[PDB]
C-alpha cells in the first residue's frame, strides 16, 4: 500500500493552522510561534491570508440553504431552483478576489447544510425532502405521495452533484497550484458509542454509501475528514472511534487513483466539541494525533473559532498550551516519523503500523532523547536513538513506498 508524495520537501508529515488567531500577539509581544507550521490561514472576511483560505456558506456564489434555526429560505433552498449560470460567475468574481497572485496553499469549501446523497437526511435534515416532494406536486397533480416522494430523489441528487462538481471544476482547472476540497467528506457515522458492547467499527451501510459516493473523490485533490472529540466517551471508545474514522478516510483514497493516493489532511480540533473551553491533555492527543501519524495520513490541519482567541486571557492560555503541551508533542511525533523514514526505509516514504487494532505508537523513548526550549523560544532536540528502539520499531512498524520514491 503506497502513499502520497510530500508537498513540501524535507517534510513527510505536514501541519496546517487555520484559525483567526493572527491578531493576538501571543506573550511578551512576540507575534508568532508558528515556525513548525508550513501553512497559516485566516478565515476573517476581509483578511488575505493565502496559506489556507476557506470559503464558507455565505461566500463563493449563490449556495442555497434552508436555515435550520428559525430563518428564511436563501437562494431557493434547494439545488433545483438555482440558475447554475450566475453561480459560476459570482464564483469567478470571488476566486479573482481572494487570490490575486497564484501561490501554494489549500482552499477548503465549507458547505454542509444538505448532503448530496438521498437517505442520509434523517432529522432535522428531513426538510430538504419535504420540499423535494411538494415541488413535484406543484408541477403535476396526477402522481400520489409515493410517486412524488420517489421523484423527489431525482431532483436533489442530480441537482446537488451538478452543483458541487462544477463549483470545484471552476477551481481545479483555473488556479491549480492550490489544493481544492470539500469539508467533512467522507463520513462513516459513529453515533452508537453509548450502547453496550460498543465498537466504533462503521456499520456496513455507511461504508456502502461512501463507496457509492465515488463520483466526488474523482474531483477534489485533498480530503478533509473530522476527527473531533467529545467528553461522553471512554479511552477505549475514543481510540476505536478515531481509529475507524481515519481508517475509512484512508480507504476512500484508493479509488481516484490506485498508485498515488490522495493527500489526507486530518481536520482536527484541540478543544472538546461538547465543552468548547477544555483542551485535550496529552493522553487524548495520543489517540487523536498519534493514531493519525501512525496510519499514513499526509498531515494535520487544526481549526479554531474566536471563542478561545478573542480575549487576552484566551491568548495567554493558548500561549501556555503551545509552549507546554502542543509544540513538544509536535516535535516528538514529527521527529519520530522522520527518524522512522530515514533509518528504517532510506526515505522511501512513511511507516505504517502492522496490526492497527493495537496501541502501538511513534514516540521518542524518554531514556535517550531530550526535547527542550533554549532562550528565545527556538526548540532544540538532543540525543540519538539506541539499537533496541530501532528493533522494537522494526517489529511493530513497517514501511511503504512514496508516490515518487517507489
Amino acid at each position: 500500500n503506497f502513499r502520497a508524495p510530500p508537498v513540501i520537501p524535507n517534510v513527510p508529515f505536514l501541519w496546517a493552522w487555520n484559525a483567526p488567531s493572527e491578531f493576538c500577539l501571543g506573550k511578551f509581544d512576540e507575534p508568532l510561534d508558528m515556525s513548525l507550521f508550513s501553512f497559516i490561514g485566516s478565515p476573517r472576511i476581509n483578511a488575505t491570508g493565502q496559506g489556507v483560505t476557506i470559503f464558507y456558506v455565505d461566500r463563493l456564489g449563490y449556495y442555497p440553504y434552508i436555515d435550520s434555526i428559525t430563518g428564511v429560505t436563501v437562494n431557493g433552498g434547494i439545488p433545483q431552483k438555482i440558475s447554475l449560470q450566475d453561480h459560476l460567475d459570482k464564483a469567478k468574481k470571488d476566486i479573482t478576489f481572494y487570490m490575486p497572485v497564484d501561490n501554494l496553499g489549500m482552499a477548503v469549501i465549507d458547505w454542509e447544510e444538505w448532503r448530496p446523497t438521498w437517505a442520509r437526511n434523517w432529522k432535522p435534515k428531513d426538510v430538504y425532502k419535504n420540499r423535494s416532494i411538494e415541488l413535484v406536486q406543484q408541477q403535476n397533480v396526477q402522481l400520489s405521495l409515493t410517486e412524488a416522494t420517489e421523484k423527489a430523489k431525482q431532483e436533489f441528487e442530480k441537482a446537488g452533484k451538478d452543483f458541487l462538481v462544477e463549483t470545484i471544476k471552476l477551481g481545479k482547472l483555473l488556479r491549480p497550484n492550490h489544493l481544492w476540497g470539500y469539508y467533512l467528506f467522507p463520513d462513516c457515522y459513529n453515533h452508537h458509542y453509548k450502547k453496550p458492547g460498543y465498537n466504533g467499527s462503521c456499520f456496513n451501510v455507511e461504508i456502502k454509501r461512501n463507496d457509492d459516493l465515488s463520483w466526488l473523490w474523482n474531483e477534489s485533490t485533498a480530503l478533509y475528514p473530522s476527527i473531533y472529540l467529545n467528553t461522553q466517551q471512554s479511552p477505549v471508545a475514543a481510540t476505536l472511534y478515531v481509529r475507524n474514522r481515519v481508517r475509512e478516510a484512508i480507504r476512500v483514497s484508493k479509488i481516484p487513483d490506485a498508485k498515488s493516493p490522495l493527500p489526507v489532511f486530518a481536520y482536527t480540533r484541540i478543544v472538546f466539541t461538547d465543552q468548547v473551553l477544555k483542551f485535550l491533555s496529552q493522553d487524548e492527543l495520543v489517540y487523536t494525533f498519534g493514531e493519525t501519524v501512525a496510519l499514513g495520513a499526509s498531515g494535520i490541519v487544526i481549526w479554531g473559532t474566536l471563542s478561545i482567541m478573542r480575549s487576552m486571557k484566551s491568548c495567554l492560555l493558548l500561549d501556555n498550551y503551545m509552549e507546554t503541551i502542543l509544540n513538544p508533542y509536535i516535535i516528538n511525533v514529527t521527529l519520530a516519523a522522520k527518524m522512522c523514514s530515514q533509518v528504517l526505509c532510506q526515505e522511501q516514504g512513511v511507516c505504517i503500523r502492522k496490526n492497527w487494532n493495537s496501541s502501538d505508537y511513534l514516540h521518542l523513548n524518554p531514556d535517550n532523547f531530550a526535547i527542550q526550549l533554549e532562550k528565545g523560544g527556538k526548540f532544540t532536540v538532543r540525543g540519538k536513538p539506541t539499537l533496541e528502539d530501532l528493533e522494537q520499531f522494526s517489529e511493530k512498524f513497517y514501511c511503504s513506498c512514496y508516490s515518487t520514491l517507489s
Partner: antibody
Framework: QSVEESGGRLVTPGGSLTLTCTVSGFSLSSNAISWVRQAPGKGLEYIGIISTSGSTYYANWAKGRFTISKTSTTVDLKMTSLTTEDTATYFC???????????????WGQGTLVTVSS | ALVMTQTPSSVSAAVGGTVTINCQASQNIYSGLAWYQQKLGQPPKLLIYKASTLASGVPSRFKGSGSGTQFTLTISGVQCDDAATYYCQLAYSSTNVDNAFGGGTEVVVKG
C-alpha cells in the same frame, strides 16, 4: 578544536583511578565524547559513550566498574577494581556531527598510559 | 548479544590493489558502521563515516559498501603510504548488550 587526555599514571592492584579529557574550541552539549582503550599489542576496546543529553552507555564487560561524567569543559572517566588486565593506552574521541542519528568520531587525542603493577 | 567479527586480522598484499577488510554482526545494523585507520604509535583516523561515505581528506580513493549484517571496506589504491591497521565500529548508541570494536585488520606491504 582540540582533545587532550590526562591522568594516566602508575597504580597498585585493587585500587581505583580517574582519567580526564579536556577540550577547547567547542561545547559538550553539541558534540558527544567516547572513551576507548588499547592494550599493548592488541586491539581497541569500547569502554563507553556519552550522549548530548547526559545518557551514558557502557559495554556489558564494564558495567559495575566504570563511570563517565561531564563538566563545562572536561569529560572524566572513573574506574574501580583494577587488576593486571587493565594496562592500556586510553584515548578520547569527539563526534564531528556528520549524521543526525549516529555517532562518528573525527577528532582524537594522543593517549594516556595506565600501568598496573605492585 | 551484538557480536561483530573482523576477518582477516592481517593482510599481506603487494603493490597494486588490496583486499576489502570485512565486518560481521548478529543484530541487524542498517548503516551505522564506521571504519578507522591507525598507524603504530598514533591515534586513529576516520576514513568511512557510514557504510559507504568517505570523509574529507581521504586521497586513497577508498570506497566502502554494504548493509544488512555483513559489511566491507575496499582499499582501491594501496602504496607504501597507506600502511596501518584498520577497524570497524558500530555507530549507534550501544544497546544494553554490545561489543562494538572488532578484532582489527593489518596491512603488510611487500615493496
Amino acid at each position: 578544536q582540540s582533545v587532550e587526555e590526562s591522568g594516566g599514571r602508575l597504580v597498585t592492584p585493587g585500587g581505583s583511578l580517574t582519567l580526564t579529557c579536556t577540550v577547547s574550541g567547542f561545547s559538550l552539549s553539541s558534540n558527544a565524547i567516547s572513551w576507548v582503550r588499547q592494550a599493548p599489542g592488541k586491539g581497541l576496546e569500547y569502554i563507553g559513550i556519552i550522549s548530548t543529553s547526559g545518557s551514558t552507555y557502557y559495554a556489558n564487560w564494564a558495567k559495575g566498574r566504570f563511570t563517565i561524567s561531564k563538566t563545562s569543559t572536561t569529560v572524566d572517566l572513573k574506574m574501580t577494581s583494577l587488576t593486571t588486565e587493565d594496562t592500556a593506552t586510553y584515548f578520547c574521541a569527539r563526534d564531528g556531527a556528520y549524521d543526525d542519528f549516529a555517532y562518528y568520531f573525527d577528532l582524537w587525542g594522543q593517549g594516556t598510559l595506565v600501568t598496573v603493577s605492585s | 548479544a551484538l557480536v561483530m567479527t573482523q576477518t582477516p586480522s592481517s593482510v599481506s598484499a603487494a603493490v597494486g590493489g588490496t583486499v576489502t577488510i570485512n565486518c560481521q554482526a548478529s543484530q541487524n545494523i542498517y548503516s551505522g558502521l564506521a571504519w578507522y585507520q591507525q598507524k603504530l604509535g598514533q591515534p586513529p583516523k576516520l576514513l568511512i563515516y557510514k557504510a559507504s561515505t568517505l570523509a574529507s581528506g581521504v586521497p586513497s580513493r577508498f570506497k566502502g559498501s554494504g548493509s544488512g549484517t555483513q559489511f566491507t571496506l575496499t582499499i582501491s589504491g594501496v602504496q607504501c603510504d597507506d600502511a596501518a591497521t584498520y577497524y570497524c565500529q558500530l555507530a549507534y548508541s550501544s544497546t544494553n548488550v554490545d561489543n562494538a570494536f572488532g578484532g582489527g585488520t593489518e596491512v603488510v606491504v611487500k615493496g
